Amino acid sequence: TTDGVYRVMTRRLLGSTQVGVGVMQEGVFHTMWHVTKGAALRSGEGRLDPYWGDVKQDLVSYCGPWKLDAAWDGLSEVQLLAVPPGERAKNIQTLPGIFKTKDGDIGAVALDYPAGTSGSPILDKCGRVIGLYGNGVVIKNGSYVSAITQGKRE
Amino acid sequence: DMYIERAGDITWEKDAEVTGNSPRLDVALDESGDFSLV
């Protein structure tokens, strides 16, 4: 339960498979809903139970309410801490683009990674998690762009 | 049945590779949590 970034694994398919990634902060595990569909999670001998989730935001927290409340400043470069399946964690610096929506503007990062990278954290220069990677769209040219998906800290 | 495995600290890396562009895109979010291009 140490703070940090975690792979989300399952052994239901052939071998061991990385279905996503998440953030442990303040005793709570944060990932995207489509990684776990809200299932409970094993952490060693222990169990993590879902606490909050929302399919439309595509987010879920375990053991407690969503804790991550940093936001992109709209100006500065950020870093995807990508945790790809079978590969070491690596930081990728980028200047976010913008998802313009009817409900306001969302930061977005134009970085393409395997599906099981879903949930990897996006960081500001202070190392704070400004959102999670992996809910996005494919652009008119076939490239992938992810929202910077951030929850609300109750 | 799913399990988690620690993979690192959450830290900014001074020497990080820089890449990707900064597209400005009109999108819609539907009730299923899917983004779409307008």
Binding site: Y113, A115, G136 | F35
Partner: peptide, 6 residues
């Protein structure tokens, strides 16, 4: 969309 095939 979630980009791996989507």
């Amino acid at each position: 969309k979630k980009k791996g095939x989507x």
